[PDB]
């Protein structure tokens, strides 16, 4: 779900170390958003203040490498978190029954967003539905997609 890969960690390692003052594995709370912009992400001042409220609760004005990766995980989860997917599915769930009709999910997935391919939206129904009855159970599908 929220784990970084060794490729994500080494990219964040380099971009964080580009603003490390001593090689001690740390930056300032002021440099945080400049470090995020080195990864090409431009955060809002309200987002930076909210992340620093939790990371710098002692008011030191500083952040360590693992405390930066702590927020960078959540900033990546803003497009694919388990709670984000469960809420996004509940918008399509017609009854609140914890499921979506196979032709209904096939409609949304090929009307809205990036579009899935003809065989790719079909591949979704094979594993989103328990047996191919025409009922996707998204409450299991979200757990399956987010599990390592």
């Amino acid at each position: 779900a929220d784990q970084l890969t060794e490729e994500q960690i080494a990219e964040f390692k380099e971009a964080f170390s580009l603003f490390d003052k001593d090689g001690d594995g740390t930056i300032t709370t002021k440099e945080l958003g400049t470090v995020m912009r080195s990864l090409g992400q431009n955060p809002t001042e309200a987002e930076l203040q909210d992340m620093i409220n939790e990371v710098d609760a002692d008011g030191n004005g500083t952040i360590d490498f693992p405390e930066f990766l702590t927020m960078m995980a959540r900033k990546m989860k803003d497009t694919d978190s388990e709670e984000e997917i469960r809420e996004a599915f509940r918008v399509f769930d017609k009854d609140g029954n914890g499921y979506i009709s196979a032709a209904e999910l096939r409609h949304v997935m090929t009307n809205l967003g990036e579009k899935l391919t003809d065989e790719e939206v079909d591949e979704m129904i094979r594993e989103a539905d328990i047996d191919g009855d025409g009922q996707v159970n998204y409450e299991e599908f979200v757990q399956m997609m987010t599990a390592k």
Binding site: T79, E84, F92, N111, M124
Partner: protein, 31 residues
């Protein structure tokens, strides 16, 4: 119209599309 949701409907789909194509990598993983 009753039950209208287009603002949220069109953006909710994208979150599931990110999750789905990420999971597709597990269906083609090296073994």
């Amino acid at each position: 119209g009753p039950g209208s949701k287009r603002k949220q409907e069109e953006v909710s789909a994208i979150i599931i599309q990110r999750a789905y194509r990420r999971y597709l990598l597990k269906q083609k993983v090296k073994k």
